[PDB]
Amino acid sequence: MQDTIFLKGMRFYGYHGALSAENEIGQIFKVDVTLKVDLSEAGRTDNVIDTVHYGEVFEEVKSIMEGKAVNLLEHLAERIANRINSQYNRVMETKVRITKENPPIPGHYDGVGIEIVRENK
Amino acid sequence: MQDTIFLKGMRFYGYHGALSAENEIGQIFKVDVTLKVDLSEAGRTDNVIDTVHYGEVFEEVKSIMEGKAVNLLEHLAERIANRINSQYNRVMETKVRITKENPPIPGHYDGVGIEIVRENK
Amino acid sequence: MQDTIFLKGMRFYGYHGALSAENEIGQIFKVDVTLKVDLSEAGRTDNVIDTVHYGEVFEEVKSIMEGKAVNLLEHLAERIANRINSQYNRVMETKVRITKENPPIPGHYDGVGIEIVRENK
Amino acid sequence: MQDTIFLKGMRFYGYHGALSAENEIGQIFKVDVTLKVDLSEAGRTDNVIDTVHYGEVFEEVKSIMEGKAVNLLEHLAERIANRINSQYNRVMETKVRITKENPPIPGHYDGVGIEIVRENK
Amino acid sequence: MQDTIFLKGMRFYGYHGALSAENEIGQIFKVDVTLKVDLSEAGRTDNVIDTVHYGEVFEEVKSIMEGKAVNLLEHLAERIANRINSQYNRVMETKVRITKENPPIPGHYDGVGIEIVRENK
Amino acid sequence: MQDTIFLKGMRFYGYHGALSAENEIGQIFKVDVTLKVDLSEAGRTDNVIDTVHYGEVFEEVKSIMEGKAVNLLEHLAERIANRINSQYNRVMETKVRITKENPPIPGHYDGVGIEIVRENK
Amino acid sequence: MQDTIFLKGMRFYGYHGALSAENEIGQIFKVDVTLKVDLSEAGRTDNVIDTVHYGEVFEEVKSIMEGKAVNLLEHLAERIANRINSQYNRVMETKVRITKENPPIPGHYDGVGIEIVRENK
Amino acid sequence: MQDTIFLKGMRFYGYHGALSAENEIGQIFKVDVTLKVDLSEAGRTDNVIDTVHYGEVFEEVKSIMEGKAVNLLEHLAERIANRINSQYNRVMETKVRITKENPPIPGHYDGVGIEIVRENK
Ligand SMILES: Nc1nc(O)c(Br)c(-c2ccccc2)n1
Ligand SMILES: Nc1nc(O)c(Br)c(-c2ccccc2)n1
Ligand SMILES: Nc1nc(O)c(Br)c(-c2ccccc2)n1
Ligand SMILES: Nc1nc(O)c(Br)c(-c2ccccc2)n1
Ligand SMILES: Nc1nc(O)c(Br)c(-c2ccccc2)n1
Ligand SMILES: Nc1nc(O)c(Br)c(-c2ccccc2)n1
Ligand SMILES: Nc1nc(O)c(Br)c(-c2ccccc2)n1
Ligand SMILES: Nc1nc(O)c(Br)c(-c2ccccc2)n1
């Protein structure tokens, strides 16, 4: 089963980070969310009720990305992966990629980040 | 067998969507189609008749992407995957990725979508 | 005097547009704001008080771009140009470029928009 | 008067060109249209009737770009500039930039083209 | 063994294609070549003689991409995969992706192509 | 008279440069050529003989960019501007922008270059 | 005289800014430098001594962009414009564009900045 | 276990290369580093001490990419993979992709490079 529903390059301005200054000023966090979901019934029926509604997923991600400031991107992706799995039984697994394109790192790079894959139990 | 024939970033202006307004105004749907096909005979012969003609595939995709408006992207990719497999025996499998780069979703993202992989029976 | 302070590609999700559906669903409006301001005193002094603070300008633009939905982009740029000139005497002139990259227009383009230049009186 | 209404990167697949093969196969023509129009009344009124409707302009461009195949891009831009000026009195001047990003030219470039500016009489 | 040596987005202007007009005018063919090669000895030694020289590979690809015009991209990738495997014993496998970003296909897409993976015997 | 014929982002691999190593290894030189030419007769007639043929211009640029290695980009643009003006009476003026995106300069930048504008006498 | 020597998109990680946190963490500052210089003698002679050496200019910019942290971008561009004019008599005028693509501004934009043009006296 | 910590498109100006001229002039080396690390404890705890600190990783990469000039990119990636594994027990495996976007190769391509994956023992 290789079907997926995705949300690419979602961007939020938040205040997460392990450095004090980071939390004060803030920055843009890029988010990629890919969900493993069987889409053949929805492909057959065309009924939005036989699949997972991405608008709702974006809201879940947004509320976490734009909410209380935490330390790690690991903590943000885990809160997201655990929030999507809990609310949707159709999501057999959730992958969250979070990117800090502009962290307090003296250098020239395209970005730094983490990525987790969490199956739904 | 890892050979593939692909059509990348095909773009169509259509009226699909589960929201009334969506169907009225319309939007651009991005499409990525990758077909699993053995290309060694065509690689040996150079005869366009020993492989799958992509122009014809683009027509198949286009006619569905620019035809009657449906609800789900799941329904569009399923109609496409099922239309390419049916007409081409050389396509051992069909993967369809459909992206809504500008859905009625209040936010900043690069796009939302679904992706299905359907083997040919 | 060719000095300028600029804000490029600001993006807001708003509900402006002359079509009903437009106001319902909404879309992303891209904004470019360039202000004619003499920057030599600020260049000499280094005091943020001898120049125009762009953060404040972004707020002005944001509040208009993300506020009550109007019809024309012409009305949005005029409200912005008139709001920046009124509040800042240092701005000898204000240019506002507003782009609708994804309007309800059946076609393939990079975007449509308007641009106004309004001197401060 | 520096106000403008623009349509950027419009793209059409057409069969224009001075070479036989060109007209047979065809290619993508990129089009940039910028109109000099006073937008202060529309900025004050917010009435779409005090400005020029870009949707209609896109249609004018499209119908020429996707119609009978001609030789020169000079002929296409002249037909467009002359068609927008004729139908709109508010357009004090029309600039048409047409780009052939992939002409039958053995080389590596981003594109070739022409650009004309035609005032409305 | 997941080590690889790659050549990305190589571009050549050639006259391949199954349509007469195609061979007359020509077009740009994009090429991606990834070779499976054990790079630990070269990583340990730093001697260019313990790895595969990419300059030579580019020459091999170039000479085929810019040589006699064939029909299929399948034939070009097969000639390339077979030419790199034959000349280099260190290449355990060769993957060739060929893209026609601007084929004689009436539409809007990013490109069409094929991709083959050929192990070295 | 604001009409223009352009050739954008032409790219050539050459050995120009004031440093010995530069001439040995070589690099990619980006070239932008914009010609001031009255295009109304060509716009009226559609005859390729009432305008300037860009294919020929690309050849002129290419032959200089890919020929004998010189020192300055100033010398390359001057040879180009002087070669286009001499051969074409319709070109009222020639602008040549040459960019070295990857010069032997220890740093992070998008590119360095020169640009000249030479009227035809 | 429209000749110019340019340095585009130079990027430096520095600690400038009017906010304490800004100076602590730091960020990437993008710089565009365009110099008005007569390039015909250099175009005729090909001698690097009849024009302005951009490598040296990059060093001047770098040393200021990567040196002591100041408040305004206005102060950085003024120090740069004044440092290039002073050291080079051939530079009839200097334009400095400085961009903060990621300032401490809660929002979605491509960047904010200033631009100054300073003639050489 | 599919969790990963990544550093994308890091860029350094170095003097590596097998050609004399290469080491003299130098060039920009692009680096992609992806580390296999279990991030669930860090996702649960939010303590930066239960995961791998990317800033430190960037320093490790930087010091090698900007240090003594070697011959092969294979030698640079091996030094990096071996330096990250040695210092971090949490990194179950290290993948290093090094790209030479502008090597002394007469042609038009996006880049050439190598990629290694080294598990931590
Ligand atoms: N792995 C990881 N995840 C995060 O979310 C942060 Br913030 C850091 C980190 C902490 C301090 C300095 C640099 C990076 N490291
Ligand atoms: N999964 C899925 N596939 C589609 O094609 C649509 Br439209 C939606 C959807 C429906 C309503 C609101 C938001 C998204 N969701
Ligand atoms: N000039 C202009 N400015 C705007 O803001 C809009 Br919305 C429209 C318009 C109105 C109806 C259809 C198409 C475009 N036209
Ligand atoms: N100026 C100009 N405008 C056009 O539209 C074409 Br097609 C050509 C042309 C004709 C023949 C060969 C190359 C270019 N030249
Ligand atoms: N599979 C495949 N490989 C190629 O190289 C070509 Br050309 C075509 C093809 C042939 C005719 C029309 C459209 C595509 N099809
Ligand atoms: N102005 C200018 N034009 C060129 O073409 C070169 Br090469 C250089 C130059 C010479 C030496 C070092 C750095 C730049 N400078
Ligand atoms: N004009 C200008 N130039 C700068 O260099 C800075 Br920093 C600011 C500024 C200061 C405080 C808040 C927001 C912007 N404003
Ligand atoms: N495989 C490999 N790795 C490197 O790091 C270099 Br430099 C070269 C190489 C050597 C000489 C000419 C062309 C490429 N080849």
DSSP C20-56: HHHHHH-EEEEEEEEEE---HHHHHH--GGGS--HHH
Closest residue by Cα to residue B38 from A111, A87, E78: E78
Tell me phi and psi for residue A52, to 5 degrees.
Answer: -100, 130
Whole-number Å distance, alpha carbon E49 to ligand 8 midpoint, is 9
Q: Rounded to 5 degrees, what angle do the CA atoms E95, E97, E102 make?
A: 175
Tell me phi and psi for residue D29, to 5 degrees.
Answer: -110, 125
Question: Could you tell me the two tokens for B92?
Answer: 């051992």
Pairing mode of beta strands F27-36, E4-14: unpaired
Do residues A40 and B91 lie in contact, with contact meaning Cβ atoms separated by under 8 Å?
no
Interface check G29 vs F, CB under 8 A: no
Q: Whole-angstrom Cα distance, residue E108 to residue E111?
A: 9
User: Would you state the torsion angle of the CA atoms of residues C104, C109, C111, C114, taken in this order, to the nearest 10 degrees?
Assistant: -90
Whole-number Å distance, alpha carbon D7 to ligand 7 midpoint, is 33
Using the beta-carbon criterion (under 8 Å), do F5 and D107 form an inter-chain contact? no
Tell me phi and psi for residue G22, to 5 degrees.
Answer: -55, -50
Tell me phi and psi for residue G17, to 5 degrees.
Answer: 145, 150
User: Which residue's CA is the closest to the ligand 1 atom numbered 3?
Assistant: A72
User: Would you state the torsion angle of the CA atoms of residues A84, A87, A91, A96, taken in this order, to the nearest 10 degrees?
Assistant: 0
**Nearest-neighbour CA in chain G from A25: distance (Å):** 5
Residue D85's H or E segment, with its range, is helix D73-87
Residue D59: CA count within 13 A, CB half-sphere: 7
Tell me how far CA of residue B103 lies from CA of B31, E107, G74, H3, in angstroms: 15, 22, 40, 30
Partners of residue G98 in chain C, C-beta under 8 Å: none
**Any idea what DSSP says for residue D118?**
E
Tell me how far CA of residue E63 lies from CA of C29, D67, E14, E67, in angstroms: 48, 40, 11, 6
Tell me how far CA of residue C51 lies from CA of B108, C10, C56, in angstroms: 31, 21, 12
To which residue do tokens 């401490």 refer?
G104
Tell me phi and psi for residue F78, to 5 degrees.
Answer: -75, -35
- Using only C-alpha atoms, chain H has a radius of gyration, in whole angstroms, of 16
Catalytic annotation on H100? Answer: yes
Residue F9's H or E segment, with its range, is strand F4-14
Q: Is the CB of A53 under 6 A from ligand 2?
A: yes
- E93 beta partners: E36, E119
- List % helix, strand, coil for chain C (3-state, nearest 5): 35, 30, 35
Closest residue by Cα to residue F59 from F38, F101, F88: F88
Mutation test residue for ligand 1: of A16, A74, A75, A100, the one with most atoms within 8 Å of CB? A74
Q: Which residue is closest to D10 within chain C, CA to CA?
A: C109
Q: Whole-angstrom Cα distance, residue A92 to residue A74?
A: 20
Written as one letter, the residue type at D80 is I
Interface check G119 vs C, CB under 8 A: no
Length of chain F: 121
Question: Which ligand has its closest atom nearest to the C-alpha of C98?
Answer: 3
CATH class assigned to G1-121? alpha beta
The total of other beta-carbon atoms located within 10 Å of residue B49's CB is 9
User: How far does Cα F106 stand from its chain's mean position?
Assistant: 26
From the CA of D72, give the closest atom in ligand 4.
5
Closest residue by Cα to residue A109 from D49, H54, D108, E44: H54
Whole-number Å distance, alpha carbon C84 to ligand 7 midpoint, is 16
Q: Whole-angstrom Cα distance, residue A50 to residue C78?
A: 46
Mutation test residue for ligand 5: of E19, E70, E116, the one with most atoms within 8 Å of CB? E19
Interface check C18 vs D, CB under 8 A: yes
Q: Whole-angstrom Cα distance, residue B46 to residue B39?
A: 10
User: Would you state the torsion angle of the CA atoms of residues E64, E66, E72, E75, taken in this order, to the nearest 10 degrees?
Assistant: 0
Using the beta-carbon criterion (under 8 Å), do E28 and D108 form an inter-chain contact? yes
String of DSSP letters for H9-45: EEEEEE---SSHHHHHH-EEEEEEEEEE---HHHHHH
Do residues B97 and B61 lie in contact, with contact meaning Cβ atoms separated by under 8 Å?
no
The total of other beta-carbon atoms located within 10 Å of residue A1's CB is 11
Written as one letter, the residue type at C40 is S
Do residues B119 and B106 lie in contact, with contact meaning Cβ atoms separated by under 8 Å?
no
Any known ligand binding at E35? Answer: no
Q: Is the CB of D81 under 6 A from ligand 3?
A: no
Catalytic option among G30, G36, G95, G100: G100
Partners of residue E42 in chain H, C-beta under 8 Å: 72, 74-75
Instruction: Kindly give, in sequence order, each residue whose CB lies less than 8 Å from that of residue E67, ignoring residues fewer than 6 positions away.
Output: none
User: How far does Cα A76 stand from its chain's mean position?
Assistant: 8
The total of other beta-carbon atoms located within 10 Å of residue F90's CB is 16
Question: Could you tell me the two tokens for H49?
Answer: 């001490």
Q: Is the CB of E5 under 6 A from ligand 5?
A: no
Residue G41's H or E segment, with its range, is helix G40-45
Angle between helices H73-87 and H54-65 in degrees, nearest 10: 150
Whole-number Å distance, alpha carbon E104 to ligand 3 midpoint, is 35
Q: Whole-angstrom Cα distance, residue B52 to residue F119?
A: 54
Written as one letter, the residue type at D94 is T
Q: Whole-angstrom Cα distance, residue D21 to residue D102?
A: 13
Q: Whole-angstrom Cα distance, residue F4 to residue D98?
A: 11
User: Would you state the torsion angle of the CA atoms of residues F32, F33, F34, F39, taken in this order, to the nearest 10 degrees?
Assistant: -130
Interface check G40 vs F, CB under 8 A: yes
Angle between helices A73-87 and A54-65 in degrees, nearest 10: 150
Q: Whole-angstrom Cα distance, residue B105 to residue B17?
A: 12
Kindly state the greatest CA–CA separation across chain C. Answer: 52
Question: Could you tell me the two tokens for H5?
Answer: 């910590």
Q: Whole-angstrom Cα distance, residue C12 to residue C64?
A: 10
**Nearest-neighbour CA in chain B from A72: distance (Å):** 22
User: Which residue's CA is the closest to the ligand 1 atom numbered 9?
Assistant: H53
From the list H75, H110, H113, the residue facing E46 with the nearest CB is H75
Written as one letter, the residue type at A105 is I
Q: Whole-angstrom Cα distance, residue C31 to residue D86?
A: 30
Helices (H) and strands (E) in chain B, counts: 4, 4
Instruction: Kindly give, in sequence order, each residue whose CB lies less than 8 Å from that of residue A27, ignoring residues fewer than 6 positions away.
Output: A13, A14, A15, A17, A100, A102, A103, G102
Q: Is the CB of G72 under 6 A from ligand 7?
A: yes
Q: Whole-angstrom Cα distance, residue E119 to residue E82?
A: 9
Instruction: Kindly give, in sequence order, each residue whose CB lies less than 8 Å from that of residue E30, ignoring residues fewer than 6 positions away.
Output: E9, E10, E11, E98, E99, E100, E101, E111, E113
Whole-number Å distance, alpha carbon F68 to ligand 4 midpoint, is 28
Q: Whole-angstrom Cα distance, residue F31 to residue F75?
A: 13
Pairing mode of beta strands D111-119, D4-14: unpaired
Please name the chains neighbouring F, where neighbouring means 3+ C-beta pairs under 8 angstroms: D, G, H
From the list H101, H104, H107, the residue facing F25 with the nearest CB is H104
Tell me how far CA of residue G25 lies from CA of A102, A106, G14, H48, in angstroms: 11, 9, 9, 18
- Using only C-alpha atoms, chain G has a radius of gyration, in whole angstroms, of 16
From chain B residues 58-117, the ones with a CB under 8 A of any chain C CB are 101-102, 104, 106-108
Pairing mode of beta strands C4-14, D111-119: unpaired
Sign of CA dihedral F50, F54, F55, F61: positive
The experimental technique used to determine this model is X-ray
String of DSSP letters for E4-47: EEEEEEEEEEE---SSHHHHHH-EEEEEEEEEE---HHHHHH--
Q: Whole-angstrom Cα distance, residue C1 to residue G118?
A: 9
Q: Whole-angstrom Cα distance, residue E90 to residue A83?
A: 48
Q: Is the CB of H117 under 6 A from ligand 8?
A: no
Burial of B68 (0-12, 13-18, 19+ CB in 10 A): exposed
**Nearest-neighbour CA in chain G from F40: distance (Å):** 26
Question: Could you tell me the two tokens for E27?
Answer: 């077009």
Q: Whole-angstrom Cα distance, residue B77 to residue B52?
A: 19
Q: Whole-angstrom Cα distance, residue F83 to residue G44?
A: 13
Closest residue by Cα to residue A89 from A32, A31, A38, A34: A38
Q: Whole-angstrom Cα distance, residue F61 to residue E117?
A: 39
Question: Could you tell me the two tokens for G23?
Answer: 């100076």
Mutation test residue for ligand 3: of D6, D48, D90, D91, the one with most atoms within 8 Å of CB? D48
What are the residue numbers of the active site of B? 100
Do residues B29 and B11 lie in contact, with contact meaning Cβ atoms separated by under 8 Å?
yes
**Any idea what DSSP says for residue A35?**
E
**Any idea what DSSP says for residue B121?**
-
Instruction: Kindly give, in sequence order, each residue whose CB lies less than 8 Å from that of residue C54, ignoring residues fewer than 6 positions away.
Output: C5, C7, G103, G105, G112
From the list C6, C48, C51, the residue facing G115 with the nearest CB is C6
Closest residue by Cα to residue H30 from H49, H54, H7: H7
Tell me phi and psi for residue C46, to 5 degrees.
Answer: 80, 5
Any known ligand binding at A73? Answer: yes
Closest residue by Cα to residue G99 from G8, G7, G30, G14: G30
Q: Is the CB of E78 under 6 A from ligand 5?
A: no
Q: Is the CB of E55 under 6 A from ligand 8?
A: yes
Do residues H96 and H29 lie in contact, with contact meaning Cβ atoms separated by under 8 Å?
no
Sign of CA dihedral E67, E71, E74, E79: negative
Closest residue by Cα to residue E103 from E93, E94, E113: E113
**3-class DSSP state for residue G9?**
strand
To which residue do tokens 């300032």 refer?
G103
Q: Is the CB of G76 under 6 A from ligand 7?
A: no
Written as one letter, the residue type at C91 is V
**Nearest-neighbour CA in chain A from H49: distance (Å):** 10
**Any idea what DSSP says for residue D50?**
G
Q: E strands of B15-84, at which residues?
A: 27-36
Q: Whole-angstrom Cα distance, residue F108 to residue H108?
A: 21
Residue H84's H or E segment, with its range, is helix H73-87
Closest residue by Cα to residue H76 from H52, H60, H53: H60
- E31 beta partners: E10, E98
Mutation test residue for ligand 3: of C72, C79, C97, the one with most atoms within 8 Å of CB? C72
Partners of residue B104 in chain C, C-beta under 8 Å: 25-26
Do residues C52 and C36 lie in contact, with contact meaning Cβ atoms separated by under 8 Å?
no
Pairing mode of beta strands D27-36, E4-14: unpaired
- Alpha helical stretches, state H, chain A: 20-25, 40-45, 54-65, 73-87
Do residues F118 and F94 lie in contact, with contact meaning Cβ atoms separated by under 8 Å?
yes
Instruction: Kindly give, in sequence order, each residue whose CB lies less than 8 Å from that of residue G28, ignoring residues fewer than 6 positions away.
Output: A102, A108, G11, G12, G13, G101, G102
User: Which residue's CA is the closest to the ligand 5 atom numbered 3?
Assistant: E72
String of DSSP letters for D26-41: -EEEEEEEEEE---HH
Q: Whole-angstrom Cα distance, residue D23 to residue H95?
A: 49
Interface check G51 vs F, CB under 8 A: yes
The total of other beta-carbon atoms located within 10 Å of residue G87's CB is 12
